[model samples]
Target: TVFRQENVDDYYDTGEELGSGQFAVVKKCREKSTGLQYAAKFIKKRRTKSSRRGVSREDIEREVSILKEIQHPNVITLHEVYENKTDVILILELVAGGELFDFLAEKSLTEEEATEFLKQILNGVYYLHSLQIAHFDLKPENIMLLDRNVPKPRIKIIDFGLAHKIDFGNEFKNIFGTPEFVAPEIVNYEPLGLEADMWSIGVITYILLSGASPFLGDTKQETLANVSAVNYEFEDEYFSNTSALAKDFIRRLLVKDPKKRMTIQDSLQHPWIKP
Candidate 1:
């Protein structure tokens, strides 16, 4: 029963739509039995006539499988799933705070705040890599804040729509992921590996510190060119104010050569990452 087509009122009351895209709509909902808050991601299977690029039954299944495989504190938790005739319902843990991108847009984060966020992100990445899963999409929009009461805010990575398991010994060839955060090897159409994830982390770190992307272009092509050429300038304002260890970590992570990028273990030892 991959495609459930039940009436909207049967399982959960649909609240305001949280977000919408090509494949699905995320809505706030409550569990009928426990009264626990959850985000119900409704994904429609692709039709034969529709573009194959959109969500498919396989995609939904894969996402569910991946979520079930990986369980980490920094990863978003998937509670359960339901299915009927035409759609699949994914019950997800409710992250109360908001998207990290929204927080970044609201104001520049202090060094402490930025470091804490980055640290958590790295921890999640490390765990994912350990499981041989690559979060092909790593951006602020996919990171949701969970707790504000903790000394350092916590975030859970979401949107496993593009995530895939990669073999370390094998090279992955696919042109997928956001333009600004994509690695040089990916832009060049070269085979990618785990290093590609590190590059995205560099872009994310830059945004966290400076509150702006290092590379910006008018069109998608222009953006790809910038990424392919590794055309980026780090502002002295950001680097000067940031700790030397932080700068070093970013430098190693953003290396253009996929073969020479920083490893997760090495990154964990960076001076900026306080234990």
Candidate 2:
């Protein structure tokens, strides 16, 4: 078990705030023994069973469970977990490069660079799928780089808040995820599987290549409607410079039927992504 009741402050010297969210805060920290840098993620635990103010026990447990099960260059690494009266601190590998979305918006990238980034994402997803895990929430905000200063930034997937371990024998359904990135099945409330992740990857690739979101709308309802209907296009303004193989890759993944969507293996073998 990852639970360590001992105080975290005694073991690590916590410093500057790295980032934060509704119920979590990440701080820069260094171990007292080795002086190695790490990120201390403080997740606010729910005080009661029915409150919506903090994260539920089940969610925290699932994140920890999945984190413990995975180990890959593209996946965020969890060093240890600590429990206090009000928070559960997760010591994770520090990723200083920041969000991939920001990088994409800031830098002028070539198709080859996009291919490399997508390959890393596919590799991480392939590893997760191999373990029967589906990261239901896969979006640009969750994708990060190990070091942006490097010529070739290494991709790392983060925030497994909606991740789940799938059992093929059983069905799973949930209408949760960013509308622009979610698959048609998700908007339709259809049974979800690893195929859901493929759709997100497709959306990501589309954005990476064109600097435009395919299915986004003015409102949430409109966005979801576009998703359910699978209505999107690569307008010439954006796709004029894009490659045919890349368009074909996105088409294969954005299929209306989950079963027909590109599998992680299929994606890895795609001409645009295949090395």
Candidate 3:
């Protein structure tokens, strides 16, 4: 709502590039006044009449609205918004920590450590679920750390581009999200709700407990098929040290029926997370 009038570059000095997507690029920037570091996300807006190639204005507004509503430490913080002629720039909190899986791979992760990480992720999920919001895209890449140098790096959920607020009267449905992390309902093109997010959480927990992905297959088509059929198993080679409670938690969440799947509250109360 409060898009800054001045040029984004006037207030902040843009630095090295952090990451990039199809229509967006995030770069490191420092505030001129405080010299605080931030990630400046530049999202390209659609141009011209015939060649409709970039992101729509409505999509950018929707993403900004969601970011404005969120105030969780685990979720990435959006400081301010700026608009130029062609792009909308989002000044976001600078988190240097890399992807969750990459950090886990570097460290000799134990069940206890994994549990701590999952607890934080669940806390953020619980908060979002309470608001009836669904983060359709929740993968290891979206789940990142705050700082790699710290003893216990904080988990910060990024990328709210696909998040949506589910209304009770109206049903939202779309066939999108990462193949390996998507829920069965998503694969079947069924009505979506907060349950989809929980399903992703289940996949994440599975990967955390074991280094292997649960639903991944040889190709994208095969991966979607695996998810559609809920075809996955706990191979001893990967899950040899995983606890029974942890396995049970994943079992409940990866259910085919959203009615039978674990909710965020249920997940937080599960034996693995709770005492």
Candidate 4:
């Protein structure tokens, strides 16, 4: 079952707002039975039309069902679900370490730190692909650290609103993602698979080292144009200190042709990530 029906009040005593993404707003809640805290996402049956970038009704349903199927350390956990006349509430693990923004904003990361994060991100993406799910929208905001204070932080991928499953189709003909991280195929509106996600991963990898937007431009039109052209390069000033293996990792995945791009397994075993 995608999610079981329950009474939102009976199981959770929702407290303060934890973060956004809500039928109203995501709130911090305590499971009545276990006294454990979690992020509570209350989705109104009528509010599924939240995303303006062409999200469909089926997309919301797909997100819930796919979350039900996916189980991994790096992926966000979906704990419980509650349904009522007005809304459906989803109980999710409370990840308070917050978004990757803080970390990505710092100066260049060491090859070791970068790969540690990238490897987990790749491992999570790899596991999702292994199950035939493609996370169509993968951007920094969608990723978070499990604990900001910890030396070795655990990364978690959240917001599956645009993810697609291969069991239903080969590639989503429609496109949805932040323009800065979107792949060339998505810009061209071509049918896409896991390769599209790899492209987004490449953008994340690029930004982690330079704190620069790989495909961003002064304006949205220019950004889309850049993504369409796949017009990204490593200027010496930006990449002079970056390792060749690191550059090669991004180069392999950013290939315009999905067929020619690096596979997730190839990415995992790449010297930069493996070493």
Candidate 5:
């Protein structure tokens, strides 16, 4: 089990800080034995007791569980784990390319280009669903290219902090995403599963096609209102040039009822994706 791989200094030489979050400070680290490189996510375990934003032990456990149990080319790899009394370190597969939203920031992809981008995510998401896993928070920040130095980009879905066993009746958990790409079930405080992810994927696809958040607004409260109301528009301003197939793709994914939302396999088989 990955739990046995705890204790950092023994296997890897911790390096510079990559990024920081509520309970984690990611740093560049090197495998002492092989001299190989990886990103070390140093999760500060003590944060939970002091702040509202802190993470729980269960959260750490679930992230490690899904990342360790599932292995796929598009998903970020969890190389190893090292833990002590105060922090839990996750040695992850190195991804220097940066976030997907930033990469596509100034651009709105064409139909073919959009499908290509989504195809990779589709494959990985499908793989996750097959194993009864759900990446509860499937936002732009969590998806990235493994290597951006090259012309071609390989998608790497990172951050399983909100991941859980969804095939069963697990509850919670979306905070960073509740405003924009969140599913209706989450807004309604309903029991969710893989369908919640499909809704998020739908949001991603909508942005890929139009360069806009499906439910974003001028204020945080407004954004929350739009999300709660499922208020989104396909006005001629954005969709005039967009294809019907593309619109259909987003429509199926953005369905209000989780049960009616398109399945992963159904999404892969869509004409927009197949074409």
Candidate 6:
């Protein structure tokens, strides 16, 4: 049976709210048919008009369309979509474990662990880029941990609300993305492409190794300035202990000129990711 709002009460049992944001509220839900857990993201249709982020019905449709088309082992899966008069419900795979940010904050990755994590991230990103899809937003908070039963943890790239497919030769001009992870070209309002994703990947790799951002400043404005100018400084403590290969990989990928940045395949071939 289709899951309409009125039928939601009968099909799935709802639990506590998992998270709340400007556009939606995520809640733990149990599907009566499969007896499995899922995170149901409820988007209020009527509230879209008042959203400060300019999220609208088209934005929701765009997100749903992208999610429905993409599929990768490292990407979060959307199981079902339900809509009624008031809201749209996205029933997604539940990653019981938490965000990657929590892991970075609690424990800095060891060399081996960092390599494994970077491999997984790059693999997923490579797959996405190969499909001509740009995640647009890539950050620790959007990465979800899953129980992969491996010695190292597994991650599922989540939150594709800003994701879209771009043409191979076309340049992207959107100014949307997390400030700290955004590429210099994006902050400078220059046309961007897949290279922007590589920049964010480099930032994420640095954070994984250093437990802190390489480009952060004292204030939001300062931070934005740093990003726009591509100004960054790596702490000696973090850099000294990190592998030279890893450091070199980040340096090349994070280049200010998108044209000079390393390609996804080239990044995967880096010694740091190879071993």
| Number of the top lDDT candidate | 2
Model 6 clash count equals 0
Residue-wise C-alpha lDDT for candidate 1, range 115-188, written one tens digit per residue: 88988899999999888887778988899889655667789998888777786644665747789998888888
Ranking by lDDT: 2, 3, 5, 4, 6, 1
Clashing pairs in 2: none
Can you give the lDDT of residue 274 in candidate 6?
68
Tens-place lDDT digits, model 4, residues 100-208: 8776775567767778888889989999999999998898888889897777799999877788887754675677578898988888888888888999999999988
**Model 4 collision count:** 0
TM-scores of all models? 0.91, 0.95, 0.94, 0.90, 0.91, 0.91
Q: lDDT by residue for model 5 over 1-275, one digit each (tens)?
A: 33544567777887777678767888888998898999999887755466566566777887898888978999988987877767788889987788888888856777776787789999999999998888878888888887765555789888888788865545665545556867878777778788989999999998888888888899877876787677887877877899998899998988888888898999999988875
| Steric collisions counted per model | 6, 0, 0, 0, 1, 0
Give the Å shift of residue 275 in candidate 5: 4.6
lDDT of each: 0.80, 0.89, 0.86, 0.81, 0.81, 0.80
| Worst-scoring 10-residue span by lDDT in model 3 | 167-176
Q: Specify the poorest-scoring 10-residue window by lDDT in model 5.
A: 169-178
lDDT of 3 by residue, 1-275 (tens): 54776898789999899789889999999999998999999999889655667777777887898888888988888999999778899999887788897886875367887888888899898888887778889998888888777767799898888888787812455746889999988898888889989999999988887777899999999999999899999998888878888899999999999988999999988878896
Off by over 4 Å in 6: 1-6, 46-54, 148-150, 171-173
Clashing residue pairs in candidate 3 (N, C-alpha, C atoms within 3 angstroms) = none
Pick by lDDT: 2 or 3, better one: 2
Clashing pairs in 1: 3-84, 3-85, 4-83, 4-84, 4-85, 5-85
For 157-179, candidate 2 gives per-residue lDDT tens digits of 99877888897722465746889
Q: Who wins the TM-score comparison? A: 2
Q: Which residue pairs in candidate 5 have backbone atoms (N, alpha carbon, C) closer than 3 angstroms, thus clashing?
A: 7-83
Model 3, C-alpha of 163: deviation from truth (Å) = 0.5
CA RMSD of all predictions: 2.2, 1.6, 1.8, 2.8, 2.4, 2.6
Candidate 6, residues 1-275, lDDT tens digits: the string is: 23445557677888978678777888999999889999998887755467665356777787888788878888988998887866788988887667788767766787788778778888888998897777878888888789634578899888888777777544655756778898888787777677788899999989988888978888877777898777887788777888777789889987888889997888988877765
